[PDB]
Design a protein around this ligand. Structure first.
Ligand SMILES: FC(F)c1nnc(N2CCN(c3ncnc4sc(CC(F)(F)F)cc34)CC2)s1
Length: 463
């Protein structure tokens, strides 16, 4: 550590931690290793072990510098740079693989790999444990510790790797994904980009600079103490650090960080700041501007906010928008997280929303989503995008499980509402062949349940 990095210690409060992040973010290269160790230290003493806590776990320079020394010793001793000569100020694939193997080989042989609080360099040093994306971040922190200015974190919506090399144009796998998936460590991500899977976002993934890597570690703070309790101290810290980053411009290219900040503001708004809705919309604008509108979660964050607020119309619209993104992907093997999310929206969340709407309609509600043909159009657009996603994918998406809920959800709208949607080859155009074939069935007084099931699952025959 440099003398100027040490002058704010000891850190005695949330605001002292924010001052350290501001100071580092004002430097040429914010120090990822220092900042991750500080966040892991404070998270450990606020969420993992609160014994003796009276306000804030003071981070003394001696403690943090010792952890920093342990990390830098471990990386510098194990990775000999002279063996990997650097042309043009850029790293080689062999060097990036070496750093990734050093981190990997340091981890405990066996542990629950999706526990909370194993994301930071504090966990790596004190517990020899990291989660999947934590391994990728630790490789980028180790590379910065080694002076490898070209190695940066790459992020999709469900995975992490690194970019490096001439023009930052190379990619390398550095960590595992999911469970059971054989890992492709050391390889490029080009096969996954070429197959048009959600996991690699058709190439529209995030290439972080160092300030975005700071934003990633801030998003990675986990305030959870247990299943029903969060640390208010860590929530406040994360929220303040996200605002710092926002004010400096470093969330411009980071949709998920904007959604996380909107979620925090919903929980506890900061006076004089944008509303959660404005922030969800900025996340969607960011995805449109920098990522070809190929991200799913900007719309999912928005839908979840409208869902929690029972804005049924706007929740349906946002989930329809989610499906309009997914329709231009191929459902591939390791995309199971987004499949689980769409399955839960179609087969649990929407049905529960519409069941409540049906009860409130019975009680005299006006302006109900169930009487709005634009809402029925959003429900149809959601299923259309799911059906179009399925087209040209290796694995199928839909099955009879889904058909039961579709028939139920359609039946929540009276025929006189359903009949007002105009399906053009509210006005809606279908992209999927499944929904085009379903058109006549959708606007019938009594829903033909068996015919709908046949059309959605392309089941050839009946009993
Ligand atoms: F839109 C709603 F459904 C969501 N609510 N929380 C969502 N999250 C929680 C925050 N989150 C994230 N937030 C910021 N950055 C990243 S980078 C990343 C992929 C990986 F973990 F690095 F591998 C995930 C992620 C993942 C998605 S989506």
């Amino acid at each position: 550590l440099k003398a100027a990095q040490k002058t704010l210690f000891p850190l005695r409060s949330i605001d002292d931690v924010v001052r350290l992040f501001a100071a580092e973010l004002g430097r040429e290269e914010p120090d990822l290793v220092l900042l991750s160790l500080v966040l892991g230290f404070v998270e450990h003493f606020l969420a993992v072990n609160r014994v003796g806590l009276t306000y804030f776990p003071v981070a003394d320079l001696s403690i943090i510098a010792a952890l920093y020394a342990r990390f830098t010793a471990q990386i510098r001793g194990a990775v000999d740079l002279s063996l990997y000569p650097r042309e043009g100020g850029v790293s080689s694939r062999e060097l990036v693989k070496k750093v990734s193997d050093v981190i990997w080989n340091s981890l405990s042989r066996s542990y629950f790999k999706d526990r909370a609080h194993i994301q930071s360099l504090f966990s790596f040093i004190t517990g020899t444990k990291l989660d999947s994306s934590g391994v990728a971040f630790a490789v980028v922190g180790a590379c910065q510790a080694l002076g490898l200015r070209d190695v940066h974190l790459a992020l999709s919506e469900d995975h992490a790797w690194v970019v490096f090399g001439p023009n930052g144009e190379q990619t390398a796998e550095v960590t595992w994904h999911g469970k059971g998936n054989e890992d492709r460590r050391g390889q490029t991500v080009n096969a996954g980009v070429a197959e048009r899977s959600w996991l690699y976002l058709k190439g529209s993934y995030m290439r972080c600079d160092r300030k975005m890597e700071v934003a990633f570690m801030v998003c990675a703070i986990n305030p959870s103490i247990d299943l029903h309790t969060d640390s208010l101290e860590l929530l406040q810290l994360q929220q303040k650090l996200l605002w710092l980053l926002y004010d400096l411009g470093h969330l411009e290219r980071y949709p998920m960080a904007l959604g996380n900040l909107a979620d925090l503001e919903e929980l506890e708004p900061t006076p004089g700041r944008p509303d959660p809705l404005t922030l969800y919309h900025k996340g969607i604008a960011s995805a449109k501007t920098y990522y070809r509108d190929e991200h799913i979660y900007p719309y999912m964050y928005l839908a979840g906010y409208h869902c929690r607020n029972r804005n049924v119309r706007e929740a349906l619209q946002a989930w329809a928008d989610t499906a309009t993104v997914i329709q231009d992907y191929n459902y591939c093997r390791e995309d199971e997280e987004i499949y689980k999310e769409f399955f839960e929206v179609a087969n649990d969340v929407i049905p529960n929303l519409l069941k409540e709407a049906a009860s409130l309609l019975e009680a005299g509600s006006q302006g109900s989503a169930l009487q709005d043909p634009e809402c029925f159009a959003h429900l149809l657009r959601f299923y259309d995008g799911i059906c179009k996603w399925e087209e040209g994918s290796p694995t199928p998406v839909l099955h009879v499980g889904w058909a039961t809920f579709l028939v139920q959800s359609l039946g929540r709208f009276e025929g006189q509402v359903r009949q007002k949607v105009r399906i053009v080859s509210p006005v809606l155009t279908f992209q999927s062949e499944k929904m085009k074939g379903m058109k006549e069935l959708l606007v019938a007084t009594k829903i033909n349940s068996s015919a709908i099931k046949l059309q959605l699952t392309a089941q050839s025959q009946v009993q």
